[PDB]
Amino acid sequence: LDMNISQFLKSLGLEHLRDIFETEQITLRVLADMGHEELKEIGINAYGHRHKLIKGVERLLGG
């Protein structure tokens, strides 16, 4: 799922996190279960980035 995940990242303006998501093989299904502690674990060190992603999945899969 690098198709919807890079489109998702681009939508949040977090295109630079692509390499992490590819390396760690993170799909949107994987991401949907990840909170702050899990994203810290894969190298997303900025609170604001993790916040953007977490809220980003909520909008995407709850609307």
Numbering used by the authors: 1027 to 1089
What's the publication's text?
The poly(ADP-ribose) polymerases (PARPs) Tankyrase (TNKS and ARTD5) and Tankyrase 2 (TNKS2 and ARTD6) regulate Wnt-β-catenin signaling (Huang et al., 2009). The two Tankyrases are highly similar (Hsiao and Smith, 2008, Smith et al., 1998), sharing a set of five ankyrin repeat clusters (ARCs) for substrate binding (Guettler et al., 2011, Seimiya et al., 2004), a sterile alpha motif (SAM) domain (De Rycker and Price, 2004, De Rycker et al., 2003), and a catalytic PARP domain (Rippmann et al., 2002). Tankyrase polymerization is mediated by the SAM domain, a small helical fold highly prevalent in eukaryotes (Knight et al., 2011, Qiao and Bowie, 2005).
TNKS SAM D1055RT1, equivalent to D902RT2, produced two crystal forms in space group P21, diffracting to 2.5 Å (crystal form 1) and 2.9 Å (crystal form 2), both with six molecules in distinct asymmetric units. The TNKS SAM domain was highly similar to that of TNKS2 (left). For both TNKS crystal forms, non-crystallographic and crystallographic symmetry gave rise to left-handed helical filaments established by EH-ML contacts. Unlike for TNKS2, where protomer contacts relied on crystallographic symmetry only and were therefore uniform, the TNKS SAM EH-ML contacts varied substantially. However, the equivalent residues (D1059T1, K1066T1, and K1081T1, respectively) mediated binding between a subset of protomers in the TNKS SAM crystal structures. Thus, contacts not seen in all SAM-SAM pairs are still generally relevant, probably occurring in some, but not all, configurations of the flexible filament.
